[PDB]
Structure formats: structure tokens, C-alpha cells
Design a protein around this motif. Structure first.
Motif, PDB file in Angstrom:
ATOM      1  N   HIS B  77       2.431 -69.676   3.911  1.00  0.00           N
ATOM      2  CA  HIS B  77       1.319 -68.773   4.193  1.00  0.00           C
ATOM      3  C   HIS B  77       0.093 -69.539   4.680  1.00  0.00           C
ATOM      4  CE1 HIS B  77      -1.123 -65.008   2.727  1.00  0.00           C
ATOM      5  NE2 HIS B  77      -1.300 -65.282   4.007  1.00  0.00           N
ATOM      6  N   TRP B  78      -0.247 -70.640   4.007  1.00  0.00           N
ATOM      7  CA  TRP B  78      -1.420 -71.409   4.409  1.00  0.00           C
ATOM      8  C   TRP B  78      -1.215 -72.052   5.775  1.00  0.00           C
ATOM      9  CZ3 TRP B  78      -6.112 -72.159   4.951  1.00  0.00           C
ATOM     10  CH2 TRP B  78      -6.635 -73.396   5.348  1.00  0.00           C
ATOM     11  N   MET B  80       0.706 -71.008   7.921  1.00  0.00           N
ATOM     12  CA  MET B  80       0.808 -69.894   8.853  1.00  0.00           C
ATOM     13  C   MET B  80      -0.570 -69.368   9.238  1.00  0.00           C
ATOM     14  SD  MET B  80       3.251 -66.625   8.520  1.00  0.00           S
ATOM     15  CE  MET B  80       3.415 -65.448   9.851  1.00  0.00           C
ATOM     16  N   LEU B  81      -1.553 -69.509   8.345  1.00  0.00           N
ATOM     17  CA  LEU B  81      -2.907 -69.043   8.623  1.00  0.00           C
ATOM     18  C   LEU B  81      -3.755 -70.105   9.312  1.00  0.00           C
ATOM     19  CD1 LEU B  81      -5.406 -67.184   8.307  1.00  0.00           C
ATOM     20  CD2 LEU B  81      -5.620 -68.046   5.969  1.00  0.00           C
TER      21      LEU B  81
ATOM     22  N   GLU E  29      -8.264 -64.796   3.058  1.00  0.00           N
ATOM     23  CA  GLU E  29      -8.436 -66.136   3.611  1.00  0.00           C
ATOM     24  C   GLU E  29      -9.203 -67.030   2.643  1.00  0.00           C
ATOM     25  OE1 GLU E  29      -9.823 -66.286   7.621  1.00  0.00           O
ATOM     26  OE2 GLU E  29      -7.996 -65.309   8.344  1.00  0.00           O
ATOM     27  N   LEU E  32      -6.907 -68.072  -0.189  1.00  0.00           N
ATOM     28  CA  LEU E  32      -5.946 -69.079   0.248  1.00  0.00           C
ATOM     29  C   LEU E  32      -6.606 -70.449   0.347  1.00  0.00           C
ATOM     30  CD1 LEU E  32      -4.408 -66.688   2.831  1.00  0.00           C
ATOM     31  CD2 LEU E  32      -2.993 -67.883   1.152  1.00  0.00           C
ATOM     32  N   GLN E  36      -6.032 -73.971  -1.680  1.00  0.00           N
ATOM     33  CA  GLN E  36      -5.935 -75.278  -1.038  1.00  0.00           C
ATOM     34  C   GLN E  36      -6.916 -76.274  -1.648  1.00  0.00           C
ATOM     35  OE1 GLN E  36      -4.469 -77.147   2.015  1.00  0.00           O
ATOM     36  NE2 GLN E  36      -2.903 -76.181   0.729  1.00  0.00           N
ATOM     37  N   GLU E 108       0.574 -61.003   7.210  1.00  0.00           N
ATOM     38  CA  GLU E 108       0.551 -62.461   7.230  1.00  0.00           C
ATOM     39  C   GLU E 108      -0.226 -62.983   8.432  1.00  0.00           C
ATOM     40  OE1 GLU E 108       1.765 -64.971   5.216  1.00  0.00           O
ATOM     41  OE2 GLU E 108       2.057 -63.429   3.680  1.00  0.00           O
ATOM     42  N   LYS E 109      -0.025 -62.380   9.608  1.00  0.00           N
ATOM     43  CA  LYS E 109      -0.679 -62.855  10.823  1.00  0.00           C
ATOM     44  C   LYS E 109      -1.932 -62.081  11.216  1.00  0.00           C
ATOM     45  CE  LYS E 109       1.466 -64.472  14.434  1.00  0.00           C
ATOM     46  NZ  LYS E 109       1.567 -65.956  14.503  1.00  0.00           N
TER      47      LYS E 109
END
Lengths: 49, 104, 49, 46, 302, 49
Positions: B77-78, B80-81, E29, E32, E36, E108-109
Motif C-alpha cells: 500500500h505504501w 503503491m501510494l 495518506e 500511512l 512509515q 488504493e489508487k
DNA sequence: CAATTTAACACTTTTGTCAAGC
DNA sequence: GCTTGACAAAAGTGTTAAATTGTGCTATACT
């Protein structure tokens, strides 16, 4: 009939992988149960395929 | 009457045990701890990994050929983003959101 | 579940039945049915039987 | 053969099922479309 | 029906709007990237403060919940798009599930910076997933995607030609309107056929279904099989009449023992003999055998 | 995911529905992802607080 | 579209055919 | 009783070329 099960089963094995929401997973499990029921008894539960 | 057939060509060999060929038995262990055996022919090399009855891939008991065969994980996912946005944009967005929860 | 997730566990589908029978004591139901048969009078005895 | 006295039935705990099988059916495909050979890891797999 | 329950379920949540989808995507976002940053700090083991730890553990979980809400909001759109392919090949609920996978990919996109509605972008992925699933899983014998597209084109132009010429279009018309050779269009035609169930009701009723009146052309026929068991024996006897060396070359050359048609060079290892002498012996034995005195015995298994 | 064999779920009597006291309609709702069922409840901890 | 499989062939090697004879 | 040299079509070498197959992606808005 067997094939119909696999198509569902494999799909479930993917939905659990990516963490799908509960509604989709429950729907897939319901489809799998109905498919197995049809495989063993076509028409015992609901209307037969 | 209707006529049908398969691809399973028949043979009339009567040699149930007439001819005996040499063979060797390899043994494999699965990830879950189940073990299986396979009587390979005495030809070339024994494969390192084998698809067993339970469906899991099992490794040869003796142990050799440490080759994972070109591992390639799927697009996360990451990852992919990361294409849709710049890293600086994500840093700024995270900083802005952290300001919102600071104010709460 | 949100309030008291630590105290009780719920489930849905065939997994729920599997987990519920995993801890099912077979003897207890038979003993209770026999006791009801020797104790009940009306339909309760019939159901136990 | 010809040595039977009685035949009995019972439930399967899926251990019998895993013992019977010679391999699991991973895929739904049955046979190739232009060639008529069985597809591996699917139904009719050799 | 087993589908109306799903229809009831999907009504729990309400539809979104543009700006709502905007901050939903922003939160996804941000969460996510927060995960990270979590991984980046954990690689070093940096001490995430107690208050900041809880704040980040809230923001990431809120991002996941936003993803879940966004996915659950568009189930009506997924069902509506999937409803177009009902009644051919695949079940309605299977189509709905494949559309759900397509919607998951769209989420997802999905990009919010563009300012575009989620509805337009989802409909691409959902339709693509539905079409792929229908192509892959709609037939017992699986044909690849390209062949499925070719077959669909063949059907489309066949219908158009039938409507235009107003008659059963011969394969030549199909080829002319498809710009492909007659042989290839015939191959596609035969590929497009669907197997008939072996459990039909041939005979107007259930006395016989379909297969009670099908004969195996590949059947084991006794008279032939037994004859074979005799033929070997006969040969085993006939080859005994020859000399040891003469009989051996024929047995090894045709491999009556092992089955391998050993070449002359291989047979040369019997005594280090060259190919030519073995060939001469084989020809002499052939001359001896094909004479009526021996061939008349075997002149029925032809 | 696990599935239930139809022969023992439906049939009147329902062999499963008799093995465990769930009503025939209760099992249908639990199995086909319609209603939750409490698999286990920690009675001692609930009584403690 | 990139990956996988299959036909295609200019050419090499293993194999099978004659005439001669120590 | 058997072998050497001259030839030959057939069975492979090795790579390339054409056909086939699996795959991610389409951003007016549509529930």
C-alpha cells in the motif's frame, strides 16, 4: 459445482490477505457456506442453482 | 448410439511386474512439520522443494541448494501510494494533521 | 464489545459454532436430559427424551 | 477381497479427509482449451 | 433470495460528498506516512514520547477507519455497476464481490489532489475487475483473455452481419467483415462452443439422462487383448528357432526385453562388433523370418 | 474458513441443533452470518468488578 | 505491454546403406 | 566370419522469430 466452491474459496483467501472490511469478508464466507451446501445438497437450503 | 472418448490412450502391455527399474527415495519436510517420501528415479538430481499432499511446499530433509528463486514481494500500500505523491507532500500533510490533534 | 471486550467474546458464522463446541462437555447434556426425564412431567420430559 | 463380515460408517474429522487425498485442488481450471490435456494443480490434474 | 440480505446490509452507511472524500483521503495518506515514520523510528529505536505515542496510535487507527468507511460507502455503486452483467456466465453475488475488489483497488489508487469525484475513478477499476472475473471464471474450460475478446468480437460482427444481410451469414461473410482467414474464424467458432451437461434428460424423460447410451471407442476389447498375449508368446517361440546370436540381435534391436530400440552401435558392444555386421545379421534374420515357413504362422495378427 | 455440513444442520431433527440446545432458527441465523453468538463469557471476572 | 511458449532453420552430429577384402 | 571408407537422410544444436498468455491501468459523474 466443485469449481464454484474453489472460485469462492480462493477469493476469500485473498480478501483476508489485504484486510478487507468486515462486510465483504462476511459476505464471502456466506457465499462459501452456500456453495458447500449446494455441493452436498442442491436445494436443501434456499433454491437450488 | 452416441460415441465418446478421452485423451487416455490405452495400452495392451501385460507386464504388471515383468520389468523392474531402479529407484531412489527422497524425503521432504513441510513447513507445518509433516514429512513425506517420494520414490524418484536414479536420474540427475533430486529437486530441492516439492509440492506435497497437504499442499504445502516441503524442503529436502538433507538440506542443500539455498536458493529462494528471485523473491519479489507484491506492491505494498505504501509503495503503491508513493508514486501519487511526493515525500515532501506526505511530510507536510503529516505535520498538518499532527497540528490538528495538538489542538484537538 | 467496545465497553467490555476483556470479559466476553462473541463470534458469528461456522467459526462461532466450532469454537462453542470446542469446549462442549458431552456428559453434562446427557446427565441433564436424564434428570429432566426423571423429573419432568409434561412436554419437558418429551423434549429431554 | 471376498473377506468381508460387516460394513461400518461414521463421521470424518477432516483427518480422514487429509489422509485420503493425494493432493489439494489449488485452481478451478479443468483442461486446456485448444490442447486437451489436464491443467496442473486443478481439477483433472494428473 | 440470498442477495437481499446484502442489499439490507449495505444500507447501514450513507453516501459521501466531494469534500468528505477529500479529507478521508488526506487522513488515509497521513496515517500511512505515520506508519512509515513509526517504522523509521523503530529501526533506530528512537523514544517516541508517551503523549505523542498515543496521538500517533490514534491518527493511524483513524486513517485505517477512514479507509474502512470510504470502502463501505461505495458498495451501492459497486452493486449498481455489477448489475449490468447479470444473467450470463457468472452469479450476481460473485460479480458483486469482484466489483468490491475493483473498488478496493480504486480506493488504493484514488488521488484527492486532482479534485475529481471518487465515483468517476472507481467506475474504471470496478468495471475492469468485473470484466476480468467474468472472462476468467465464466466457463468450465478456461479460455485466455485475448481469446475471450476475439470470441466476443466474432459474436458482435456475427450479429451485425445477420442484421444487415438478413440471413444466416456464411463463414465467408464473417471473414470478410473480420479481415481474418476462414480457417481462423472457424477455429474461433469451434472454440466458442459450451460443453453440454452429461446429466441431461435425453429421451424426453428421466429413464436415461444422457450417458446411458454412449459407447467408449477406446474400450478394452477382449478378443484383441488376449490375442496380444498370444502374439508375444508366438514370437517368443519363433525367435527361439533362430541361433543364439541371430535371435539376440532381433530381440535387442526391437527391445522385446527392455523396449529400447537399441542402435547398431549399442548392439556393437555385444562383442565389439561394428554396425555393418549387425545390420547384415539383422537382414539375414529378416529374410529367414519373412519366408512362409515362419511368416505363415504369424500372418493373422496384421 | 470452516463450514458446516448441511446433513446435520437441517433435516428436522437438526442433529447439531439437538447436540447443542440452540433452536433450529437460532442456528440458521448464526451460521448464515445474521446474528452474533457469545462463544465464552468470563463469569468470574465479571463478578469481580 | 512484458513474459512465456512454440515454429523455424542453417547447420552438426548420430545413425543407416553400398563396394571391397584381409 | 567379420571390418574400413564413402556417402546419405534423419535426429539434434543453438539461437532467433512469431504466436500465445498474464497483467496493471483508463480520473465529467453515475450509488
Amino acid at each position: 459445482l466443485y469449481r464454484r466452491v474453489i472460485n469462492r474459496n480462493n477469493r476469500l483467501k485473498r480478501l483476508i490477505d489485504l484486510g478487507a472490511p468486515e462486510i465483504i469478508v462476511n459476505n464471502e464466507k456466506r457465499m462459501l457456506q452456500e456453495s458447500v451446501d449446494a455441493l452436498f445438497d442442491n436445494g436443501r437450503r434456499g433454491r437450488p442453482v | 448410439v452416441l460415441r465418446g472418448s478421452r485423451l487416455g490412450a490405452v495400452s495392451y502391455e501385460t507386464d504388471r511386474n515383468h520389468d523392474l527399474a531402479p529407484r531412489q527415495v527422497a524425503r521432504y519436510r513441510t513447513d507445518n512439520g509433516e514429512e513425506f517420501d517420494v520414490p524418484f528415479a536414479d536420474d540427475a538430481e533430486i529437486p530441492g522443494t516439492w509440492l506435497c499432499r497437504n499442499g504445502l511446499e516441503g524442503t529436502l530433509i538433507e538440506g542443500d541448494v539455498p536458493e529462494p528463486k528471485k523473491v519479489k514481494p507484491p506492491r505494498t500500500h505504501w509503495d503503491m501510494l508513493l508514486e501519487r505523491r511526493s515525500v515532501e507532500e506526505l511530510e507536510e500533510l503529516l505535520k498538518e494533521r499532527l497540528d490538528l490533534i495538538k489542538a484537538k | 464489545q467496545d465497553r467490555y471486550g476483556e470479559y466476553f467474546t462473541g463470534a458469528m458464522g461456522a467459526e462461532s459454532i466450532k469454537k462453542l463446541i470446542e469446549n462442549f462437555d458431552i456428559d453434562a447434556e446427557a446427565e441433564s436430559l436424564r434428570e429432566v426425564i426423571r423429573s419432568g412431567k409434561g412436554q419437558k420430559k418429551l423434549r429431554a427424551l | 477381497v471376498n473377506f468381508f463380515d460387516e460394513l461400518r460408517i461414521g463421521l470424518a474429522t477432516a483427518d480422514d479427509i487429509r489422509n485420503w487425498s493425494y493432493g489439494e485442488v489449488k485452481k478451478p481450471e479443468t483442461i486446456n482449451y485448444r490442447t486437451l490435456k489436464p491443467e496442473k494443480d486443478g481439477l483433472f490434474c494428473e | 433470495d440470498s442477495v437481499r440480505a446484502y442489499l439490507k446490509q449495505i444500507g447501514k452507511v450513507a453516501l459521501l460528498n466531494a469534500e468528505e472524500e477529500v479529507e478521508l483521503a488526506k487522513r488515509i495518506e497521513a496515517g500511512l506516512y505515520a506508519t512509515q515514520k513509526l517504522a523509521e523510528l523503530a529501526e533506530k529505536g528512537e523514544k517516541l514520547p508517551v503523549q505523542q505515542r498515543r496521538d500517533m496510535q490514534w491518527i493511524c487507527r483513524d486513517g485505517d477507519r477512514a479507509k474502512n468507511h470510504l470502502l463501505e460507502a461505495n458498495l451501492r455503486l459497486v452493486v449498481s455497476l455489477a448489475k449490468r452483467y447479470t444473467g450470463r456466465g457468472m452469479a450476481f453475488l460473485d460479480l458483486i464481490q469482484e466489483g468490491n475488489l475493483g473498488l478496493i483497488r480504486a480506493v488504493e489508487k484514488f488521488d484527492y489532489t486532482k479534485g475529481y469525484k471518487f465515483s468517476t475513478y472507481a467506475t474504471w477499476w470496478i468495471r475492469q475487475a468485473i470484466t476480468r472475473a467474468m472472462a476468467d471464471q465464466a466457463r468450465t474450460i478456461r479460455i485466455p483473455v485475448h481469446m475471450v475478446e476475439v470470441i466476443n468480437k466474432l459474436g458482435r460482427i456475427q450479429r451485425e452481419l445477420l442484421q444487415d444481410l438478413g440471413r444466416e451469414p456464411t463463414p465467408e461473410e464473417l471473414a470478410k467483415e473480420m479481415d481474418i482467414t476462414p480457417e481462423k474464424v472457424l477455429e474461433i467458432q469451434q472454440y466458442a462452443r459450451e460443453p453440454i451437461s452429461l446429466d441431461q434428460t435425453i429421451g424426453d424423460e428421466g429413464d436415461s439422462q444422457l450417458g446411458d447410451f454412449i459407447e467408449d471407442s477406446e474400450a478394452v476389447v477382449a478378443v484383441d487383448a488376449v490375442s496380444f498375449t498370444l502374439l508375444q508368446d508366438q514370437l517368443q517361440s519363433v525367435l527361439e528357432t533362430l541361433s543364439e546370436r541371430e535371435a539376440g540381435v532381433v530381440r535387442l534391436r526391437f527391445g522385446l526385453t527392455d523396449g529400447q530400440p537399441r542402435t547398431l552401435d549399442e548392439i556393437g558392444q555385444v562383442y565389439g562388433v561394428t554396425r555393418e555386421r549387425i545390420r547384415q545379421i539383422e537382414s539375414k534374420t529378416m529374410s529367414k523370418l519373412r519366408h512362409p515357413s515362419r511368416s505363415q504362422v504369424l500372418r493373422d495378427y496384421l | 474458513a470452516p463450514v458446516t455440513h448441511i446433513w446435520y444442520f437441517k433435516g428436522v431433527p437438526s442433529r447439531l441443533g439437538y447436540l447443542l440446545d440452540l433452536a433450529p432458527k437460532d442456528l440458521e441465523k448464526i451460521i448464515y452470518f445474521a446474528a452474533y453468538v457469545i462463544t465464552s463469557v468470563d463469569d468470574e471476572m465479571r463478578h469481580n468488578e
